[PDB]
Each structure stands twice: as structure tokens, then as C-alpha cells.
Design a protein around this motif. Structure first.
Motif, PDB file in Angstrom:
ATOM      1  N   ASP A 273       0.793  -1.235   0.000  1.00  0.00           N
ATOM      2  CA  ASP A 273       0.000   0.000   0.000  1.00  0.00           C
ATOM      3  C   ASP A 273       0.814   1.269   0.000  1.00  0.00           C
ATOM      4  OD1 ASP A 273      -2.646  -1.464   0.302  1.00  0.00           O
ATOM      5  OD2 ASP A 273      -1.816  -1.919   2.249  1.00  0.00           O
TER       6      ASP A 273
ATOM      7  N   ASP B 189       5.098  -2.773   3.288  1.00  0.00           N
ATOM      8  CA  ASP B 189       4.550  -1.469   3.624  1.00  0.00           C
ATOM      9  C   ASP B 189       5.569  -0.672   4.435  1.00  0.00           C
ATOM     10  OD1 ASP B 189       1.010  -2.154   3.701  1.00  0.00           O
ATOM     11  OD2 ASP B 189       2.252  -1.086   2.227  1.00  0.00           O
TER      12      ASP B 189
ATOM     13  N   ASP C 281       0.115  -6.434   6.166  1.00  0.00           N
ATOM     14  CA  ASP C 281       1.256  -6.543   5.270  1.00  0.00           C
ATOM     15  C   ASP C 281       2.628  -6.514   5.974  1.00  0.00           C
ATOM     16  OD1 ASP C 281      -0.353  -6.643   2.896  1.00  0.00           O
ATOM     17  OD2 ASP C 281      -0.833  -4.547   3.172  1.00  0.00           O
TER      18      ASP C 281
ATOM     19  N   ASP D 101      -0.779  -2.724  10.427  1.00  0.00           N
ATOM     20  CA  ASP D 101       0.447  -2.484   9.693  1.00  0.00           C
ATOM     21  C   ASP D 101       1.367  -1.654  10.545  1.00  0.00           C
ATOM     22  OD1 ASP D 101       0.632  -3.931   7.275  1.00  0.00           O
ATOM     23  OD2 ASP D 101      -0.689  -2.526   6.276  1.00  0.00           O
TER      24      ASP D 101
ATOM     25  N   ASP E 234      -4.942   0.004   5.673  1.00  0.00           N
ATOM     26  CA  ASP E 234      -4.981  -0.829   6.866  1.00  0.00           C
ATOM     27  C   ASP E 234      -4.754  -0.061   8.158  1.00  0.00           C
ATOM     28  OD1 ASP E 234      -5.362  -3.419   5.442  1.00  0.00           O
ATOM     29  OD2 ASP E 234      -3.418  -2.907   4.568  1.00  0.00           O
TER      30      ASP E 234
ATOM     31  N   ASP F  81      -1.269   3.861   3.944  1.00  0.00           N
ATOM     32  CA  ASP F  81      -0.882   3.248   5.206  1.00  0.00           C
ATOM     33  C   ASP F  81       0.090   4.143   5.985  1.00  0.00           C
ATOM     34  OD1 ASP F  81      -2.393   0.995   5.853  1.00  0.00           O
ATOM     35  OD2 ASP F  81      -1.374  -0.191   4.287  1.00  0.00           O
TER      36      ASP F  81
END
Ligand SMILES: [Ca+2]
Ligand SMILES: [Cl-]
Lengths: 413, 420, 413, 418
Positions: A21, A158, B21, B164, C21, C160
Motif C-alpha cells: 500500500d 509497507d 502486510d 500495519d 490498513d 498506510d
């Protein structure tokens, strides 16, 4: 097949954007690493790799000496110095092979440790086989002629782009002046309380008395800062202190020394302050730093055999490694050790590093940047592959022959 | 059902990897927390929980005194000290229950109620910490609960403040040797620092008649939050036209209960030279082991004195300057904010308020443990994150609270193990 | 239609939660920006926008003077000061239009470009020079008529991203009414390391009043609080020397924004290490315009000296400039420049925009502002990724001739 | 599937283990019922041997004001199995612990329990405090914290291997002797546990004479024993001094620090100079002498000189090793695992009530065999796979070894419906 997965497992085929992302306009690049290292007289040595390093620093080579100590040989970098052309970076994938080329010539032990260099509890050729419990992160007694392949596996996605330590526009009277914007996001911080009412006492001595207050393991490859303060109390008159900080390398050698106190006179019955205001720039670090120590010299100007010298101290320091906690910046570490290789042989290193980059201002005028291919199932596929890592046998260190077979088994499926 | 969702909503069933992630090779662990706290003579108290703390600090207990001030009792931690075995950590899920478990011999009637709320700030940012005032700390109906019977109890459920998130350094000890046996060296939680900037003076004029012993002033006092290591830097510049003045300056870090947790000399018999910029730098580092209870404020004291002075002559100076307080890893979500407060009142003195919970983590072993602890990337679960996002977006419709009357949370658990 | 995409490409329609996220309970808000800027006598000027700024700072206006230098006019902010009501923030989307709205007594054109670095990194800021700051055809626009105007659209520099502390005031009380205390944007600091001297030799004949030098000058960027640490070490054989040292922070227009004494009558002792520490903290309220450079001045003097007396010393040292939260994407980079020329003097260049945010209320407002996790929208992120990867094919620009942006909006609805 | 039912809900009765240990046997349930009295600190510890193949269920200890534990009593089954059977295998077992009364002066509730299942034997625990126990294991389903004593905890025995052999029960054997106090049994022996200790490797002892001798303790080690054991080995003593005589005793210490058994290993053994003086042990400690679980062993030596005088010297060097054999000690369940149930803040004088069931596969003694038919046991084709499936999904299913009783009860319902 999914470009990213291809790039991740077979870095030598080229770069691909990380399917996470972190949507930034960037460009993709591959940097090769090529070295022909020479084997010392014990026929033993160690290469320390920073598999996830977000930039041009790939590793460091040390030769093992007859006295049992390691001796630094040199750093292992990418073909070109990324900071000279780019300002930001993210590591996409990487792989390096190590094998003898000046060929039955010795063996290699390799392991991927989840900490940083100074955290290893044993760095001997055989001791490294226990640094991790993961069977897919260690490989033993591979023939040096066949070689070993180091494959970089992710330590989180990320991740943000990292500033590369690129030079900044600056002018100064000193021609040796250096100015850079450093890797800083995610600093690592060490806190050392050197003294808590520590009592120092000793008989006078011309030239003073030296003590090493403490010594601690820390890790640093690029810029760092040391701040804090020691407070001294004393009942004796005429005492003066000299204090120095030393940053030591993995080979035991001094890499950096900084004066913290010079002829700092102590006044009776008062809080005597000794601040730390140190900044160690990257260009001054000639090899990885693995420890820090503080030396204090106590002296009495007009003293004479017999006078007692004494003081009590309390204080804490903070060592900040800029960008030190950025995954890949200091940890993990992959060690490739070799032994019984004929002296004078060539240990050949060859690899590829793939990055997401943002050009510097001059290069930005000619380098187009983009967001990068949308690939809907690339991340899921990566997560699936990594969760099945043990079943699929995806290693961080491989006997090269097996990695080669693995590559075939992948391209022919 | 999705293991992560089950761990998230029912922490006591164990851990699961966060489906985001942040792909690191790690291991999963569950640490329990068990405490039997004693109720003071007012029958009132306050437990401050750090629901998202990435590590072993679960909260702190304070009793309310007859004078209306709080008094620190003790920290609430996990069964074992994680930094002794691990170097990195991420919080997966957590839940704690608070309920009375005793009645000293003599009291026939059980008594007491609980008010609980989840505040999106850090401890010192609360505007009201009274039993009834807490009910307004947030406007979210699912983040507050009122007048629950102490015997039934309350359940605190940790809900995410972002995913994350990176792994956090645990404040683990590093290899070190020193002449001082009390020497301490750790690698601390640092990523995402919180920074406070305080301009204490901008040409502030100080003036007062001499006095033997000096004249003391408190230049400023500000609310800040710290649980682990922090540093204070910067500088004060002093100007004076009077001769013979000397300064003494001290920093104080104060706890939630008003007590002094830490004092540091910043200036000691620092003489002021006329017609010159007199510099007073701050180079303070406060290690974790010195903080005995959460820090909620900082203040600076300056003592002005004139050695060879006599009654009558005037002391004076002007000052300018700023300080920067850095809380290492302070802005890491869960490290200082959010905070869940569980207040109780009218509980019989001498009773036992029992705390019991579980914390689930993704961890990276220290070097010694890494020799025997296998680490992995963690089960691939394709729709786990989407399902989590769906559940949280429907939080109000589903009634997923951060604080619950325990009976309701228990009913919620059943209603969950049936539908899945 | 997917709300987030609508917000991203058409910010004036309102906010939407970022589908990443970073699951935080938050609230959504739109803040407008409206300015009527006056054109100076050259008819030329520059508006510097911080398209990704996570907060109320939208930009800065500079007029171009007859002598070729720029002159700071004012900051461009949001309608209200976010830090007064909120403590955390993330930028969702933003767009601003710039066009002429007045005639005194058509005239002029605009060039605009989005540069991937921070302000001081631009190599050329002239009206025409800007066209080459980037190689991306969709990040530059040229000679648009001022009356028609240009639209600046904020495109992501990563998702993010964490919430940012706003620089909100904290509870505090002090003797000084001018006392200020805040909690600043800090996560992801930017760090510059400057080695000002490495055994630099200074030498000059005495002079009443002292000899002044500017040891170095370097480009750096700062909009909000920063700190400066480090130390210089001086050596000398001459007696009776004293140093005065000052740091200056310079603005884009060349003006001095901040000055700090670092050394005042610091006497140098012979044959020892003379320490000159740096302990500066520059609070946001003191920075009146973006800072683009830093320089250090040293004045050397010998109180009781006479012609012929030679003054000299050697120095070594490094400084570390930490811009709190400076590397947070959007806080300093990227920058969108809108330059105009040939506009009639006294005309009004009108700015109008909208900024959308995810916010966490301060304690007082939290009592009445409900916060939530925000709409689950399963394919919103994929769709965003798809759109951005097809950026070139779809012609999604960061700078647009307003008429085209308008057509683009229809073609979308 | 009967076996699964028995395994997860032992109070419903026994079932044969669906493994490959095909022996003709009989199935029995033995209850355990105890009303324990809480001491003055209000704290105590019950040690359970969840997998014990026989009548020994556990032991109760109270915590004393001085911080030490004090043995109260053993917890057994209703009847003494060895009196009627010669061989045994544990099928399943569960026990609940909760307070059932209130010493006058208290009216509502008092007390919490912490419980944990440790994979080692008793002496191997590193911390036995109320709060320390919470860390004995890392498995979340093997620990439970701060359960209200009034609600209670349930201990459920989970397997530590199947295809275990039958265990001899320590049954008496036909014997006649001149001593009315004679005892003869056939003990649990298969799978002995063995400890090897080197007490000295050229250890130098030196001391001044003293009337009555000089006493020292050579070593002390943690070992575990509940039933018969033997201690064998040999010490070798060398000396230059004439006239010395040694007395050596082995001590077996209980969990509460008290001496449980003592055996002379040397009595007035005179040392001859310039030679190896051998001191062989051959100790057999029968089960009936062991009054409480043994958690350590130590060797005491008293050196003396019968015709010595003040100022006289006493010295010798010693080497020696011994082997401690715990009969049947390594049989899974015999010594490990252990489930500890700790309680605190319980009103003094309250009753902590224990109630449980043990299910067994048994082989009758000769007298009972005349009237008790034995069989191979129901063939149940998928019982073992189902057991293995349930146990592998243990964490997902939440099958605990220690439960807050209310939850165990809910678990039983959720099972009897599905
Ligand atoms: Ca993500
Ligand atoms: Cl950071």
C-alpha cells in the motif's frame, strides 16, 4: 507468472514493484555487486551481509587471523553509489552468490540471524550453525567450489521509503566539509546508565588515573548521535577530568574517538556537569561499529604522592542510530563463513539488488516516475508462498546447486 | 471462523497473526495478567489500562485518598517480563476483567460499582478523572459503561488503533560491562517518537530583592506523558546587568498522583556574566528503570542567588529559550494512547478487586532464545483482513465494545461461537 | 461509485476514509482555503503549495521583485487552525484552484509543476525553469491563461501512513505570558548531518571588534519545529582568544527567519580540546516563513590585542539538524509550484480549495465528537491502485488547466 | 464415541482406550472426595498427578506465615486399588476444586485460584508461588488465572501418550515372616526413571577434631519420587590421617522441606590410610515409608576420631557417584505431568472441597479374578482417529487441562448437543 514473485525469488531476473500500500511515484533499478576477495593465511574468513539494507551497503568481509581475531578487509557495495543519484529508496529483492573461483578447496557455513551484528553470541565457523533455529535459515559445510546463494526474504512490507544519505547543497570554508540528508525514519535508541552514585577512589599519580567506566555492544553502519550527561560530586580539591568515547569495530579496532571532557575541573560540593553532544557522520565510519566505551581520566594538577583522588558520579547516555530500526537497516544479518580454503584463493561474490527509487533533483529532470503496475493478486500470492515457506523449502541461504534446481522447478511450472 | 477474528474478539482463546502486510518471521505468545488489588479506606480507586501497549506494561492502580488525591499503588504487568526473552513485539489482542472477589470478615453486604471508559488520548490529557466525570471522556457509546456492579465485573477489550504497525523494540538489556554494579544498558522502544516543545521564556523578566539562600521560582509546568525512556534537550539563555548572580535550575517529572518521580540538576552555581549571552543547555536522558509510575507532568525550577549580596540590592535577569521533550516510541499507537480507565467506588475497604487477563503478541526472540525458538511468517488467511474491516465498520450495529459489563461480554462470546 | 475515489479525484465533493490498513477510530472533515492575493509591480510571483501537508498549512505566496529576488507575502492556511481542535490527522484528499479575479484601472499566464523533493531542493525556481523540475508530463502544465486558471490536485505519496500529531497546545502554566507548549508532528523525522570542519585552519591578524567568518551554508527544509545538536572542537596555540558563534535559519526569500547564539565570549584555552556544543530547539511559532537554508557564523577576537597579534585556531565537528516529522510523506515533499507572470500590477490572484482529513479530536472536543472506524469498502483500494497505475493512460494530473479538470469531472460523473 | 465421551467428561464413566494395547481387562471408576481445611494465611497448594496410573491423585499443602509450605495430606481414590488389582492403565480423570463453606464471621465470598499444568515433575518447577505458577507453561490452554474459589476450577486429565503398557499397582504378594511388620509388594517398575549423581570428584575435606564429629552435607539435588525407589552406588575415601571414622546418611526431603526418609549408608566406617576405602550403598526405599512426595536428596557425612583431642586434625578426599532409580518413574503420568491448583485470600477455617473421578482399565488380583470377568473391549473403528483429530485441534476447540468450572460446564453442554 507474477512479476513481483519472480523478482523476489529470482532477483537476478530484474526488479518489480512491491505490491503493498506504499503508493509512491518511483522508478525501478537493479544494481549488481561484484567482488573477488582474497583468502588470508588461516584459510578462514567471514562475510557479513545486510540482506535487507535499503541502499548500497551490501556487506563486509573479515579474514580470520592466526591469533583467533577477525580483521576487517573491506565493505561490499553495489556497482554505483545510489546516494549520488537518488534521494529515497526501498529494497525490492536481492540475492548474492559466494564461491571460490581460484579452484575441493574448503567449506562454507551460512546462517541468517534475526538480530544485528553485535547481537550474535557466537561468530565461529561452527558456532553460527545455532544462531537461528529455523532449518531454512542455515546451511552447513557446502563445498566452496559449488558455493552458496544468499536470498533476501522480507522483514515486513509497507515499509516507508528511506532517505539515502544523499549530499545536500552546501558551501564551506573547509574543503573537507560534508553535508548529507540521512536515513532517519525509525531510529534505534540505546540507553546506557553508566553510573548511579558510582564511587571512584584512587591514590594520586602524575599523569592521572584512567578507568573505562563501561563498554556496551551496539550497532551502527551509518550516522548516529550520543547525548546525555554525567554529574560528578567530590570532596577533594583540584581534580580535573578528561573523558573520551570510543566506537569499536567488529574486529576490535577503534573506528571513532570523541573528546567529551577536556581538563574539566571539578568544584567541591556542587553538581559538576559533563554533557555529551556527539554526532558521528556516515563518512567517518570505516567499518561496522559493534561496541561503545567511555574512558575517564582523573588528575590532580598540584598533587603529590599520597593525596587521595576521588569523586562519585551518576548519569545516563542515549545513543541514537538514525534509521537504525528500519527493517533491513541493521537486522537481519546473513553470515557466510568459510574455512580450509587455500591461502591466496579468490572467494568470488556476485549479486543483484533491486530497488524502488526516487531520483535526486538533477536526475528527476530526466527520469520519469510512476506508481507501478497494478497486480490484484500479487500480495496474496506472496503471503501464500511465505506462509508455506517450510513446505516449499524457500531458504535465505542455499547450496547454490539447489537454488539453481529450485529456479528450474519454478520456471517450469 | 477466522482465527484472527476469534483472537481479536476473544483474546483468552489464544493468539493469531495479524493479517496485514507486516510480513516478519515471528512467533506467537500469550501472557496472562493476574492481580489481587486491595481497596483503600475511601472504597474508591482507579485502574489505568494501556490497552494497546506493545509489551509487558498492562496498567497502573491508584487508590483514592480521603483528601481527594490519588495515590499510586503499583504497576500491572504480564506474568513474565517480555524484554528478558524477546527483542521485538507487536500487540495482537488483549482482554482483562476486573471484579471484586472478597469481603473481609464482618461485612455482610457486598457493595460497589464500576464506571469505565476508553479515552483516545494519553493519561495526562484527561480533563476529568473523577468516577462520574469519566463517563464523558468519549462520545462513543461503545467506549463507556456505567455503574456496573463490582461483583459482576467489567471486561476491557482491546480494539485496534491501526494495523500495519511495525514491530517495537522491547527495552531489552544489551551486552555490557561496567565498574558500577548498578549499571544498566537497554535497547529501547524508539520508532515513532512523541515530541513536546516548550518555549519556557521569551524575554521573561525576573526581578527580586536579594535574600540569603536565594529566591526560587517555578518557570513553568506542563502536562506530558511518559511510561518508558525519554530525553530533554535545548537551552535557556540568560541576560543580566547585575553582577555576582548565580543560578541553580532543576527539572522535575511528576506522577499522576502528584508525587515527584524524577529530579535532574540542569544548572548548579551557574554564574551569570553581565552583558553576555549566558547559556544553560539541557542534556537529560531518563532511563525506563528510573520511572516508577507513569509521568504526567514536567516542571522547571530556578534558584537565583547573589553570593556577596546584602539586604537591599536587587537581583534580576531576563531569559529566553525552548526545550524539546522526546518520548522514545511515544507516538507508536498503543504506547501512550489510547487509555482505558476503570474506576470503582463504594467498595468495602479491605476487599479484593481482582484483575485477570490475557495479552497476545507477535514476537522476535532475543539472541539466546532464537537458538531454540523457530520463527515463521504466519498462516495465510485470504479474507481475514476484509472480515476484520467489515466487523469494525459495523462496530456500532454489532455492539463491539472496548468496555463491557462482563455478563454481557460473556453473552456476546456465546452469540459468536454459535453463528460461526 | 466508490466514495474514496470520488474524494481523491474530486476533493471538493467532500471527505471519505482512506481504504488502507490504518484502522483508527476517527472523524472526517473538510477545511476550505480562500485567499485573494495581490500582484506586485513586476506582475510576477510564486505560490508554493504543500499538496500532501497533513494539517492546516497549505502553502506560501512570494512576489518577484524588480531586482530578481523573491519576497515573502504570507502563508496560505485552512479556514480554521486544526491544532486547536484536533490532536491527530491524516490527509485524505485536496485540491486548489488559482486564477485571476480582477482587473485594476486579461493579463498573464501560469506555469505549474509538481516536484518530488522539498522546496530548497529545487534547482531552478524561475517561471520558465520550473517546467523541467520533473520529467512526468502529467505533473507539469504550461502557459495557462490566468483568467482561466489552474487546478492543483493532490495525488498520494504512499498510503498506510500513520496519523500525525498536529502541533496542538498542551496544558501548561508559566510565569511568562508568552509561554508556548505543544505536542509536535514527530514520527518520521528528517535528519541532516553537517560536518562543518575537519581540522580546519583559521588564521588572521587581530582587529578590534573581532574577525567574522561564515564557516558553512547549506540548504535544508523546515516548516515546523526542528532541533540542532552536535559540537565543534577548537584547538589553539595563541592565548587570549575568544569566540562568538551564531546560527542563522534563512527563508526562501533570503531573509533571516531565526538567529541563535551558540557561543558567547567562549574563551579558548591553549593545548586543550575546547568544546562548543549545540543545544538548539526552534519551535513552530517562531518560524514565520518556510526555512530553506542554515548557516553558521563565528567571530574570533583577542580582547587585549594589538596590531601584529595573530589570531588562529583549528576546528573539527559535526551537527545534526532534526526536522520533527520532516520525512513524513507530504510534510516537506512533494511541492507544487504555481508561477505567474505578466499579470497586471494590483490584480487579484484568487486561491480557493478544499482539504479533506481523517482526524482525532482533542480532549475537549472528544466529549462531543463521535469517532468511528469508517466504511468498509472491499474493492476501494484495488480500484485506487488500478486508477493510479493507469495514471498516464487516464491523464490524471497533479496540475491542470482548470477547464480541462472541469471536463475531466464530467467525464467521470 | 464412548472413549471421547469418557476422555472429555470423565464423570460419565469409563471406556476402553482405542489403542493397540489389547489386554483382557475390566473397566472401573473410582471417586475422590476431600474436604480440606484452609490454614491461617488463607493460602495453599494442591498438587495433582493428573496421569497417575493408580490411586494416588494428589497432595495438599498449606502455606505458612513464614513463607514455607507444610504438608497436610495425600489425596487418593475411594478405595486402594492395589488391594484388589495387580495391573492398571488410566483411561480418563477430572477433579473439581471449590470452597463449600464459610468459617463463622464471614458471609459472602473469599478467595481466588491460579492453576497450571506443568510438563515436568514436582521438583522441576522453578516457581511455586501463587503468581509464579502462571508462567510454568506457555500453553494458554494449560493455565487459568484468578478464578473465584466459590465458582471453582476443574482439572481435566489430557493424554501424555497412548499405547502405554499396563502398570503393576504395588499390590501385596503372598508372604509370611517372623516380623508382623513385614511388607512385600510387586511394584510399578516398567520404564524406570534414573538420576546419576557424582557427589565428589576428588573433593578435599579438612577440619579440626570435635567431640561428636564434624558434619557436612556433600551435595543436595532435586529428584522426584512418590513410590518405591532404590539408591545404589559407592563413595571412595582416601586419607593420610590415622584413626578416622565416618558416618554417612542419605536424606530424602519432601516438598515442604521436611525429612521423609533416612538411611544409614555408613556407620563407624573406619578409614585405613593410603588405600581406597569403599562405601557401597544399597538402599531400597519401599512405598509405604514415603509419607509425602519426595522432592530432593542430600548426602550427610560425619567425620570423627574416637580417641581424638582438641587440636587434632581430620581430613580425607572423596570421589563417588550414585544412581537413583525411581521404579516406573518415567512411565508417562507417574511423575509428570503435574497440575498445580493454588489458592489465596481464602478465609481461614474454610473448607476447600475436592471431588473427582478416575477411570481405569484393570486386571484383578488372583482372588478377585475368580469373580471378575475380563475382556478385550469394544471395537470402535474410528475412535482413535477422532481422538487424534480433537487433540490436534485442541487450541481451536479450547480443550483445557484446567478450567474455570462454569466454562467446563458450558463446554459439556456444547458437546452433548453436538
Ligand atoms: Ca497494508
Ligand atoms: Cl519514526
Amino acid at each position: 507468472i507474477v512479476p513481483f514473485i519472480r523478482s523476489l525469488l529470482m532477483p537476478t531476473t530484474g526488479p518489480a514493484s512491491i505490491p503493498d500500500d506504499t503508493l509512491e511515484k518511483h522508478t525501478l533499478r537493479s544494481e549488481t555487486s561484484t567482488y573477488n576477495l582474497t583468502v588470508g593465511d588461516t584459510g578462514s574468513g567471514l562475510i557479513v551481509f545486510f540482506p535487507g539494507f535499503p541502499g548500497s551497503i551490501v556487506g563486509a568481509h573479515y579474514t580470520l587471523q592466526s591469533n583467533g581475531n577477525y580483521k576487517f578487509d573491506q565493505m561490499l557495495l553495489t556497482a554505483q553509489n545510489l546516494p549520488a543519484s537518488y534521494n529515497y529508496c526501498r529494497l525490492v529483492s536481492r540475492s548474492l552468490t559466494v564461491r571460490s573461483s581460484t579452484l575441493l578447496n574448503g567449506t562454507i557455513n551460512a546462517v541468517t540471524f534475526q538480530g544485528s551484528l553485535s547481537e550474535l553470541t557466537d561468530v565461529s565457523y561452527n558456532g553460527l550453525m545455532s544462531a537461528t533455529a529455523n532449518i531454512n535459515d542455515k546451511i552447513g559445510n557446502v563445498l566452496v567450489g559449488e558455493g552458496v546463494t544468499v536470498l533476501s526474504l522480507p522483514t515486513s512490507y509497507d515499509l516507508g521509503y528511506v532517505r539515502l544519505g544523499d549530499p545536500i547543497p552546501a558551501i564551506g570554508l573547509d574543503p573537507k566539509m560534508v553535508a548529507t540528508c540521512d536515513s532517519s525514519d525509525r531510529p534505534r535508541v540505546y540507553t546506557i546508565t553508566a553510573a548511579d552514585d558510582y564511587q571512584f577512589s584512587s591514590q594520586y599519580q602524575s599523569g592521572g588515573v584512567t578507568i573505562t567506566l563501561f563498554s556496551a555492544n551496539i550497532d551502527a553502519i551509518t550516522s548516529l548521535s550520543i547525548g546525555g550527561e554525567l554529574v560528578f560530586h567530590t570532596s577533594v580539591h583540584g581534580l580535573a577530568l578528561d573523558a573520551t568515547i570510543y566506537l569499536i569495530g567488529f574486529d576490535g579496532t577503534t573506528v571513532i574517538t570523541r573528546a567529551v571532557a577536556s581538563d574539566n575541573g571539578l568544584t567541591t560540593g556542587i553538581d559538576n556537569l559533563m554533557p555529551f553532544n556527539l554526532v558521528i557522520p556516515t563518512n567517518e565510519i570505516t567499518q561496522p561499529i559493534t561496541s561503545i566505551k567511555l574512558e575517564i581520566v582523573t588528575s590532580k594538577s598540584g598533587g603529590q604522592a599520597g593525596d587521595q583522588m576521588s569523586w562519585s558520579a551518576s548519569g545516563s547516555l542515549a545513543v541514537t542510530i538514525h534509521g537504525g530500526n528500519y527493517p533491513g537497516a541493521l537486522r537481519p544479518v546473513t553470515l557466510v563463513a568459510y574455512e580450509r580454503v587455500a591461502t591466496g584463493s579468490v572467494v568470488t561474490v556476485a549479486g543483484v539488488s533491486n530497488f524502488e527509487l526516487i531520483p535526486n533533483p538533477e536526475l528527476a529532470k530526466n527520469l520519469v516516475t510512476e506508481y507501478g503496475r497494478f497486480d490484484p493478486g500479487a500480495m496474496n500470492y506472496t503471503k501464500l508462498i511465505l506462509s508455506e515457506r517450510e513446505r516449499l523449502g524457500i531458504k535465505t541461504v542455499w547450496p547454490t546447486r539447489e537454488y539453481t534446481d529450485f529456479r528450474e522447478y519454478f520456471m517450469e511450472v
